[PDB]
Each structure stands twice: as C-alpha cells, then as structure tokens.
Design a protein around this ligand. Sequence first.
Ligand SMILES: Cc1ncc(COP(=O)(O)O)c(C=O)c1O
Length: 430
Amino acid sequence: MKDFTPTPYTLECVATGREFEDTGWMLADPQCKTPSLVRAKYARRQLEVKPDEYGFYKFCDWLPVRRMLKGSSAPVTYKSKGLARHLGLENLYITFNGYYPAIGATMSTCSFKETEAFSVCARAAEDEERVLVVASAGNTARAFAKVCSDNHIKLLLSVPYDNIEALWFEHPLNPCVKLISCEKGGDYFDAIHLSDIALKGPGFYAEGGAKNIARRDGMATTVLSAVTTIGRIPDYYFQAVGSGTGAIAAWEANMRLIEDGRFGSNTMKLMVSQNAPFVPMYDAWQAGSRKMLAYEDDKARRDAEIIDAKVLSNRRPPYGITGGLYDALKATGGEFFVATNAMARKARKLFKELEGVDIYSASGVALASLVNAVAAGKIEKDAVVMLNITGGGEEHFKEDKELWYLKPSHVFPLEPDTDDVVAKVEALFA
Ligand SMILES: Cc1ncc(COP(=O)(O)O)c(C=O)c1O
C-alpha cells in the first residue's frame, strides 16, 4: 500500500460553529448542551480522487481515517439507459452500492454500509483495546462483521432476532465478532437500547450511528462518486431513508463540493423516502415540524414488521438533532415521499428488468419515489438525477454460495436487566 497520510481535519459543532481538535472518537462537542451533530472540517479543501487501487479510500481527502484497510470497494456511478428511457429522463445517473461485477460494483456484503464500515473502522486507533459496539437492523451489522472479522477488530453487534437472517457470510467469521439480540418482536431501536445497556460496561465504546463523522463521510462517497463521475452536482438526490444518515451526508457532501468550487455551486435537492406504514420522518416533514409526532411503541413495532424494507424502520432517527435530517431537508429544499410494499416490489422488478441486477426492498422504495415523482411532473426531463441504489446484488451474490450465519450468543428481553447484560457481554470478550 502507498505512502498514506492520515486525513487532516478538525471538528465543528453544527449548533454553534465552535471548532476544535478531534481527541480521537468525539461524537459530540462536550461544550454544547443542545443536541447537535459535529461535522468534520477537512484541511484539503479541494477533492483529489486517488487511483482505483485505493478502493473506497480513493476519497480519503474527505474521510476521517488514520489508516487504510485491505479489500474495500467504492460506490459505482453510471448513466442509466434502461431506466432512463422507461422514465423519459435524459440525465438519470445510478450510484450502485452492492454486488454487480459487470459494472465494477464489488461490495460483496451488498449495501453501502460497507462505506460506513470501512470508514469507521479506519478512523479508530489500531491500538484500540475497547470492543466496538454497533447496533443495526442487519445491513450495517453485516458490513462491520465482515470488515472487523477480516481485520481482527473486536466488535459487538446488537441486532434484533427478527433480523438475524441478514447476517450471512461467505466464510465463518473471526471470534472477535460477537452478536447479541433483542427478543423476537423487538425492532431496531430496541436493539439500540440493548447496545446502550451493554455500553454501560467497561471496555466498550459506541460507533455512534449518525453521530460518527466516519459513518456520514463514508456514506457521502456515493455523492462524491456521482459528482466526480458526472462532472457536476446533480439536481436531485433520491435515497430511501431509515435514519437519514446518507441524506444528511449527501447534503454535507454537497456543501464540501460547493466550497471546492470546481463542480458548480448548486444545491442538490434531497428526495428521500420511507416504506409505508412506517413513515414517522415523512409525517413530521409533511407537518413542517422538527418534532417527531407521537408513535406508540407497540404500533411502531407492528409497522416495522409490515414493511418490506426492514432497514427503514428507525424509531429514534437523527431527524431533529441540529445538523440532522430536518435541517438538511430545509437547507436543500428537499421533499419526502412514501412508497407502499407494492410499489417497492414493482420497483425491484423494474430495476432488475431494465438495469440487470436485483436490489434490496429499500432501494426499491427510492426507485418507487423516482417513478412517482416523475409521474407527478416534479422532475424536468433534462434534470440531473442521482438515484442512490443503496443495496443490490444479494441474490446475484448468494448464487451457488454456501453461506455462514452469525447467530446471537444471547437473546434478551425488550427491557433487560443492566446487570445481566453487562456481565454477559463482559463474559463474551474475556
Ligand atoms: C440498502 C439500504 N437502504 C436504505 C438504508 C437507509 O439509509 P440511511 O442510513 O441513510 O437512513 C440503508 C441503511 O443502511 C440501507 O442499507
């Protein structure tokens, strides 16, 4: 690997603007009381894409990484022919994050969570002796599991039992990757809660979800790939959202590109989408409100079971936090759409038929967004549209593959006892 310099950056509290050094794994500005994201301010103001050998890290100028890891792949962006003609769009670009070797997409875990995994794991110290803790609906978990296993990084995953089928792998994992689950019936936020209980134990630290600049700047490489491929900033960004981290990241990528100057100065409009009937962020945005409406916990867990796109069901997303999704929608004049399971299933067939690879339900929600937006006359036919296919190639990939599944060492009730969880996760890594 090449003579690589850790990326220079400082941190900025979005709420105030306070600028300060990252002491390592800062996930908030401790001088700020309001909930606020921090954002990386990169010293390399102008993006210089490294050669392809760098894989995902070809974008490291704007990633908070101290090292590179082997075997990464970057988002692939290409101009659509099938889908574009079907929609009458002249400038439709697909940014594909998954397994589709024909176009050069080699994210073998089949989602853009690989950008999160490779970026976050590269931000961490390699002397780090604490166990990294990650909660996921499935896709983030599969990404960190692979990367952390390949690189002997201690990782505790918190995935809901109902989602553990997502934890498939070509080969048995390293024993440095351990998994615990919230019981059958719980959803992703229940898994967050289990992971926050486990974090009460010494020797464990949190990935932090959307609070981790590595996760956002990792995800933002879809937009970097798109802009550096197309040669300008798109007019529309379509992405199904569960936490909205990738939409926040897209916005942040847009701002950095504008500060860069060489690609124009327009602001990409965010077109984000949720799977009915789990549509809390959509409902709040339709209300013009920074506050999430009231969502009775049992109903939300049922709605989470109903939707096809299981990664889309987050009860506690970075919606209202300063710098979060509400702020990004307001800043980009963005729009929020809903897709039914039915629309999503049609969208998946459509994409397979016209672009030649299978995609996740979640990506199908975004595709459905696009179809409905176009049909409503919202998209100029010459508009530059980035469709972010956040996951694809699972069928394609599992084809004639013996798969190995990560199963939980412990399954806990929805409100576990702190003592039990702590003593068990402690035991897990001793
Ligand atoms: C395939 C897929 N679609 C949609 C999403 C939701 O994206 P976000 O994290 O920006 O909410 C994810 C998140 O991991 C995903 O993996």
